[model samples]
Target chain A: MVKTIDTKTRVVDVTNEIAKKKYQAIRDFLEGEEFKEVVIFGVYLWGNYTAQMLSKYADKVYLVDIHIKFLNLNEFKLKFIRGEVNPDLIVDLTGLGGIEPEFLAKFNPKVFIVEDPKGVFDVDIYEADNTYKRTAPFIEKAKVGVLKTYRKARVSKTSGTMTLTIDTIVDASREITSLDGVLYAIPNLRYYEGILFHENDIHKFLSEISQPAITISTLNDVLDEAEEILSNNINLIYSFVEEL
Target chain B: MVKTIDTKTRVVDVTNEIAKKKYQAIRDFLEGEEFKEVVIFGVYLWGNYTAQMLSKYADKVYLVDIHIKFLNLNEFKLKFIRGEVNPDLIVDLTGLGGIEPEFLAKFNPKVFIVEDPKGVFDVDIYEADNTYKRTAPFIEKAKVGVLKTYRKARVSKTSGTMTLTIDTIVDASREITSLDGVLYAIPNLRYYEGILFHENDIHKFLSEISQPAITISTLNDVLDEAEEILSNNINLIYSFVEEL
Candidate 1:
């Protein structure tokens, strides 16, 4: 679905500067690094897009998700699998959002990668009235600002369930209400305040073992802090791929 | 939607002892009191059934809920109203489970009542493996015990999102998971640990203003704590209504 932003209708494009950079970086990483099998979990867009490139280097590329919709899988040379599998390399597009550490641990992939940005979404409810309204004179409607556009966005108000649609995805702000929508935005919120990230047990466990199997790369974990625009986030994605 | 616990097809019974006590208590409360209009939010089995009796005394009995299903409403002489309304008395079947203080504030009813049981649910995640399975040598499957039955139950793992199905509804346990299902077990978790309740700002604010607006009656706000099953929870519901 095409969501409008700033009164303009622009969709996430692979041709965008950051996207191109990311694709190039991905190309560079896969130059000689080949794996017997690669599994990408929690996909919808970037994961799917990344798998397409990975197909050329890996003997087999499998995409796993609870639900996925795409025009063609055969065209991309990707295999859709259900449940869990053991693979050489595993890319976790869904971190805390979907993939649980317990679930991911079962994969036992040599390369476990995920990109987590620093900026986070939060809402400051200065005053409360009720209904899903901006009343109570806490934050003015104008001050709330128009939500930045996203090809897709995932938003969850603080302490509330995350919903993946409606309004702008705040790549980096200090105060706001956010939403979550389909595909386009993952690890990024429709709106966000300056937030940060931390390492968890899974990453720690992988590191403790001989080779540190996990690779948690940050695009713009905190350039001072967050990135929301396609160019910025995609640049981060590209930067991580280059490292890999 | 009949979830079988203990493999017995027993349903939440209104004829149960606790239900009878609840009915009797409710009768005693309304013996002399009358209201111009009464609005009850979060209607399921208890709320709806409670309203059936309240309908006899109140000039207008308004039942408000996002979703509700029952065999008969006309037989109960109850009216379903939409949106928000100002009522003389208000009953909240949904506390932290749904109705927010802000939302509740919109309706400034003279008498605001809610039943909060004491014993809570919690899970001690021993070791992490993966899958939503009980492995990793943590709490044993048998020790987990068969879920306490419910006409319906709402189960939510300590920090995970809440789901309304499977497993047991632990009312008094100190460790277990919980789910949220339709109609029954509004607040109790399917599985739970020994947990406690704390007062929120909403309750405090209401108390500070002269005569407290809220009548948060506890069914078994932890005598030793908790009540589960049709009899226990219904008894708790009755205890609170009796106080009202």
Candidate 2:
């Protein structure tokens, strides 16, 4: 008798996932010879790990948040800011409702949108409005990746001010893999398009229509991926974005 | 012609003064072999010295302050409370607007009023209402002595709440020597009497009328007085009040 494991039991490779590859690209590029002494500005939504990660490679790391005192690191090169800064890289730790593009555009370099792992990557663009309020503008300008981390169960039972616009329910796991990723895509699910939903339900609704997306199992997986990307010799594996 | 020194240059004796004698009485009583293991409850308007003074003889010193954290001593015996207590002695540290008499009635003991050296001992009492708001009720129960320390110049120019029930404005210097001391007293200047002035100006005003009553100059004067009162075999110099 032949037996096979279900798709649920199979381990997925997040290494090729778009978000992961983008993170890897940042990681590989920063570890290069010419990137030393670059000033990186990090916007903190809540977490401190990415700031910690960037602090190791960048010569100067300035962390900006409304609550600047919340970041407790006391490094000689780490500075805390309550407002804006001109930086070589903008690593946004707060994924959704994080930072606006016009605000991020003040800095002329690579912008990284690290989505709240369990949060729905949905944006609301009203009828007359061409741009998405919070999420879409960053997607247009930066490498947007949903960091696959589970949020508290409380996120499922929320009703709040943010109303998301769903134009196309693209599989973040699948769409993120393509180099030339469409801004929004849902091949057969056009009927469910052009609707607004609460963000809590958006994650549940997206999973129903899209392929199971790739994500690092734990934050340590992020650390491991970052360390691996940084340690490896980068000349053969990645090309520099010389303009930025 | 008889040689007369001006009141400003007159040398008054604080060494054997009545206030000093009264403090000596308390000191002697607490330090005696009979008074060990007494629990002292201190009411803080906001100071630590008196609490520290009482802490020495009392087996346990529980300090009560609206802001309990304001007391900074880390003594194991110095516990803090936000409300009323049944203390063997009620030591008022923060002088003005510090404790309520009903709150003080909850604890039956000898009351000690360590007045803010620079604060006036006046209380607001409307004609129909004979009860003093903050100062007099405790004065009726305890050994009240004005701690004489001059304040900064900023105190000379303020005016606000406090309607003083001044029956008389006799010389406080001569009057304080009497009583055995009452809960409260005012001497012959009735024109300036029955008036409530800002606490800042009260001292300046009182100094102009009274003969500048006996006061313990230093906090060490307090400690020394307390220690001497505790060490002596009393009855000749300082009288004891059996009822609290």
Candidate 3:
């Protein structure tokens, strides 16, 4: 049997900045401010933690989830109820509550609350039009850079001797056959110049090019561009294929 | 109240070929050759349908699902019971019984039947080595064809008149600037050649090339291939970007 408290003034100590801010906001809105009784749906990790604080001030805290068996971890600390009951406030923490919208809608609590970050975890904050906003803490940005390199070769014949100078666009420069070889040296090959040599000199022209090691991000950018080009052309191809 | 029968020889007349075949197989197997009592899990549309036929032969038929309330549609004909009971055979219609390996393992039914269409619906079929095999009906192949074209230009000082010949590769040929235009003419474009020209002559070369409409499937094949190439290189790019 889970323990249930009728009404107790319990003070919770919070030191973490984010946690403290969230607790304070929830406390201000729900405590003696048109709301006394609250139902905390989805008693997962955060829901359970928040429910404990809400229990301190609210007249009653009813913890409910679809699968109550899975809610055993937080059951000991909080009171677990089998069915739904009328409450002043409802804190739904299941992100976008999976089907069973009617179950939550049945209560139609005056104040409904949820947590949603900007674009990362897009939870529908339209149920009761109540969303808890929290600014993401700034962490050191991951170091990422792009290095573009272009290779060109100049050939000249002097005194029956052939000389070739391989010019690399970037600081790195080396001679090689096939622009395809240059792609192999890069981490993320984003873009590469497509070359078309004269029908007769096609074989020799490829051999005269140079290959350089480049950045992966640059290569990925190139790939994305190529994919975009192909995707744009697919619709045209799709219609043409029908005619064929 | 739902109708409950002790034992009545029910003959389910099958109209469709697929249904007839399935019924024949299940009826032949569970008629007293290998199993007596059988449990049918997931009383959905198909589960309810299959269970009705199994009820004719089996001594006792047990129907169960996690949410029995949701299984009210087919509940009119079939009898649904809460809780579990031991049985000789278990017909699990819930495709790919995910999790609760222990729940199913505890029964250890001699003949654990399931609706598996071998390679078609393709579940890893390695679990307990009990895989149901059903041959998929042959679908008439879609009518498709491909056409290839070649264009060449000659330049001379005297009497220089450009001759444009639309040589159809597959009984059709034409001229166009956009390959996207050609794709609109065909059902699927499987292959397309990329051309390279000097920066100054790039626009001229594109106009000179023959563009034949291809298939959507063919164009998608190109997109998938290009996307795949980029994806393969992305990892290489990822590491290179990290180094930079």
Candidate 4:
């Protein structure tokens, strides 16, 4: 991969203990699969394995994403590309709302635009007090275990764009006692872009999403689908992953 | 005057148009008085005059305040002291509660614990986006002709200490529409300590105020009394000012 951003020095990456265990499960499953050419899309940390590890099961494994900010690929024994690759197998873990329509159309897959059960929201965390600590302008998604890092992060949220500055993760939910103003966002669909159609017929919305595609919002979801694909006994080969 | 804080660069200072015209009125009255030794308390920009201007009529003029955060005194010939002055003339513009009982003791005064009619408040404006612009910390008070300076000042107010970041001042009052909450402070008593004794009689409350003193909240109030003192024509030599 042509390293686009020096994310090693720039982005903040974190994963919850549960996410780690879940990713480990997927890694263990992938250990049993093999293929001639396997392709993975979007290399967010928690949902996928390292290139060297993926290379163990595939002859020539290809990892594709818009940026290489999350990966240190030079040492990997596999190939990394900026975009897509034709493969015998495919693992789609690009995150919700992240996979563009073209990627779905070409792959001929379906989508489930669930109204993020926990309340989906789009949020951005920025350095509040210490600018000297930040290295770059934008970092896509770095799955973090703890919401609050050691640094003071200003959590700007929602479509109304409310914000709160925090010293640590505990501060994020502290001020929200009298809920129901613009503060809530669907948890799983936070980054999910699909809107809940007012019609209430979920499949009408789900059916329109094309068909048979893995549009995941969590590591568990993708892992479950991946497990389903692998258990079919087709010599599962290609794999990819994204954020939690 | 000995300069304590280089507040010119350090503090974010702003005032509405109403205050300058009010301060100008006080300056106009002081133009007619002269003093043998005059003492002005507090160097906040909105409430008072320049040292050279006071020196125009007084043999020796002194200014007293906790800090000289809001002054640029190098060019003036007057004496600026950190605290206290026994004088033939006195201008008490040290803000609402800034002047403690010790200073008011010798003068014996009455105070009105009015429930700030317009709602008094204590506020602090801070550097938000541009840390490079700040010169020092805690500029006591430097009054300005207009608010909304070029810098992004984060207006933190009230006892609960609510804060909102703004590009300019116009953003300060915009979010405050609902009118009730911990968001209010008395207009004049923002810094005032005298409590509105549960007793309904204001005079009974007023009587306990020590006795006749120039504890002022606005420049206009200070100016009106200064004019009263000067017009009595006791060679009003020592003149002083502070913030609005």
Candidate 5:
């Protein structure tokens, strides 16, 4: 059975006494009048225990889990902080209570936190919103890359050369080929190029995925049918990048 | 709850039958014919039932699923045709008299059966193997597609141009994409060549997932680190393409 601890005063260590001493030390070190908010990541159970210990002194605490919805944002902070709206800075706390919206929107810590077999592990902090936004735009490019590569592969027999070059201007250079296995294709073959295709080969390098695809059929018809797919993917990427 | 039926008599009944009529007609049309062997593309529970019904009259039977890696493939064939196998294909048919070695080596049947949700769904047939040999190129293409599109978005300040394509030279010309409703970069994007991503859309999708992932970063990392992923995703897809 798993044990639980309170976030006020009582520091109950679970992994071992070393964790007990470590938690106490961290609590003592974080025991200051300067910092107002704490950002904790990776509160899988043991880490939560540590966070509970740190919560004793924190005026406000925020927990940040990657891709955590905004709904669970207030659960832990409601009890630990003194009506703290936003966290000024996150000092790597250890529970769900460590995630703070204010810290997320304003401070944008550049690290991550994870749980080890023994206890909590500290990770590099990052701007979640920023990272999320940065990941947009590849949705359609990937499709177009495939469509175009499919087209190119279909025409390989007629084109004399089945190789895709850097000149292929796919909407984006998303897909490459696979190497070291029967499935051989590449992505991002060339930022400057479109899409390409190649024969299947086992033992092909994974990076080979950057190359275009290889085929011996007509893909224009298939490409024609993919219109809705292209539009939907592009729009999805857009929403992720600029909206949600 | 599901029920079972048995056909002890060899009489054909097509009068007012809803679905099995077409199959019954086909069976009657080809009764007492002899062919070298029959290969079934897939064998679901229904297929097994049909095979059992046919075993009473046929000299031999053969069964195949998307992935048939049992130690003895012949045992399956012998059981259904000669009462060697349980009348029903489900349950512990393992030890009661399995297919023999010689039966495995030289035996052949003439009926073809294809049953599985995979083809009904959009997964690839080769995905039945799911090994890097079968899945790497497809994944590499997808990853590279995403990478290139991301680079394009980075440069163009646009997020809807990503695309990904997979080709095995075995499938017929076909393409499809998914939509869960998120703002895509393109106002009217479709599943032309990429799978879109959005936090809200993903959150809702996760809500429906039976084994909902607690977080998304690891999944995202799987997308970014395509090389590491190509080697790991095989086992899951491998088991997905079962015939029965």
Candidate 6:
């Protein structure tokens, strides 16, 4: 559990602090601590216990697809350069929502996915992109909870353009609420092994929903299945490590 | 920060994965490289953050206040033993008609306080507790929501003999709507040791709340303010380290 901000990934033993020992069962056996480096992996029920395991040990873990930080200034610059102030981002899962499509497209994700949990599968980006651009367009939405704002003002002795303008200040806080997307995961399954699938089944599954996608691996039964895999496949006990 | 777990509290951090960081944050801060024999402490806002930080770095960090697990267990046991079982735990923050009085008295906290960044004051815990008791007197209340049975089962399993009784088991999975008890700090006042009157006022406020008065300290605040005071008064930035 080295906590300094080390961006690099490495193999480490995290069995002691982790709550889910059953995942690999034995730390010594899985990582071959007394012998050689051994890989390990396991799953549990989708409740707090699995969350406990992931939080405690898994080195590098992330949402299959994370909502890109909508406030990233670089992406904002890209949108501004497009000569569009209020463009909409098309989401195959949740319709045209989140960041304006202009910014998301700049990221060049193979599949422009949504954060819907109920909806699953890869999307036909080109087809959905067309549909999103045409009829059902994205609208910047409001935040669900409270919209909090804070401001500080002072009498300044600055000149002309250097002075703060009310319009600029307003624009500074002008976030398109629809861009406040949900947390997501990206396994790159669509481009697994390098080929993107045009599987409409995936599209139908993804585009149908308008919210966070149901987590596939974090399901209860899925956790049980993961546990089963962990128990049977001893070789991959500590095979893969993700930098947390 | 209630020291002992033998009292009434709510589901402070219920979500699994989302709540993990609350623990991990504390862990990491405690075990980080810069600090040796890391003793991580902070004010109320750090409750979740501390839990999260500790989960990242330390083997285990001792928590001095009401723990989420302790709160749930205490609430469950106190409710059933006192012939009050099925009670709602969450409520609208501003809504009226929630909280059981006897439980509050039964688990009688020495200090009951919270702040919303706006102001700090003593909550009418006695009244709120009474309201709680009246609403749902049953020991094992109904379960609701998507993850209903899961939490119910957790509480039930931990509730001891009462949970095993056929009568308790027979109750439908209908969970009572919860009582909202989100109390942490006295907001703006928490960080300032400079406000002597406010500090005295806080002390007097807590003293008046409990009978035979418990020794309530703005401990969560003190631990944090102590560092700040040392940093400001003593020439050394890490002067606070001497106290630990």
Q: Which 10 consecutive positions of candidate 3 chain B have the poorest summed lDDT?
A: B157-166
iRMS, candidate 6, in Å: value is 26.2
The RMSD of every model to the true structure, in order and in angstroms, is 23.9, 30.4, 32.9, 23.8, 23.0, 27.2
TM-score of each: 0.25, 0.21, 0.22, 0.28, 0.24, 0.17
Residue-wise C-alpha lDDT for candidate 3, range A5-89, written one tens digit per residue: 1111100111122233444555554444544667665534334556777776677776665441233324523432434345666
How many clashing residue pairs appear in each of the predictions shown?
Answer: 48, 16, 36, 34, 118, 79
Q: Candidate 2 or 6, higher lDDT?
A: 2
- Second chain TM-score for model 1: 0.40
Can you tell me which runs of candidate 6 are displaced by over 4 Å? A1-209, A212-244, B1-106, B115-244
lDDT of 2 by residue, B137-234 (tens): 55666544333232122121001101010101112212321222111111112112111232335653444334321221110113233223222311
Scored by lDDT, model 6 comes in at: 0.21
Provide the TM-score of chain B versus the true chain B for each model in turn.
0.40, 0.33, 0.34, 0.32, 0.23, 0.17
Q: Which candidate achieves the best lDDT against the true structure? A: 1
C-alpha lDDT score of every prediction, in listed order: 0.32, 0.29, 0.29, 0.26, 0.24, 0.21
Instruction: Please give the distance, in angstroms, between residue B127's alpha carbon in candidate 3 and its true position after superposition.
Output: 10
lDDT per residue, candidate 1, A151-226, as tens digits?
A: 2233222111111111122222111101121101111111110011123344433222221111111111222222
Model 3's CAPRI class? incorrect
Using TM-score as the measure, the top candidate is 4
lDDT of 6 by residue, A10-62 (tens): 10111221223322322222242221111111111111232333334333222
| Candidate 1 wrongly placed segments (more than 4 Å) | A1-244, B1-9, B14-31, B68-85, B121-238, B241-244
Query: Which prediction has more favorable lDDT, 5 or 6?
Result: 5
Location of the lowest summed lDDT over 10 successive residues in candidate 1 chain A: A188-197
Cα error, residue A115 of model 3, in Å, equals 55
Lowest lDDT sum, 10 consecutive residues, model 6 chain B, at: B173-182
Which lDDT tens digits does candidate 1 get at residues B1-244? 1221221112232223333444454455455666778776553434566777777778777766644223232322233234333476666554223454444444445455543321123221112212112111212311111111122243222111111111122231111111121101111111111011123344433322222111111111221222233234333331324231
Instruction: Name the 10 consecutive residues with the lowest summed lDDT in model 5 chain A.
Output: A155-164
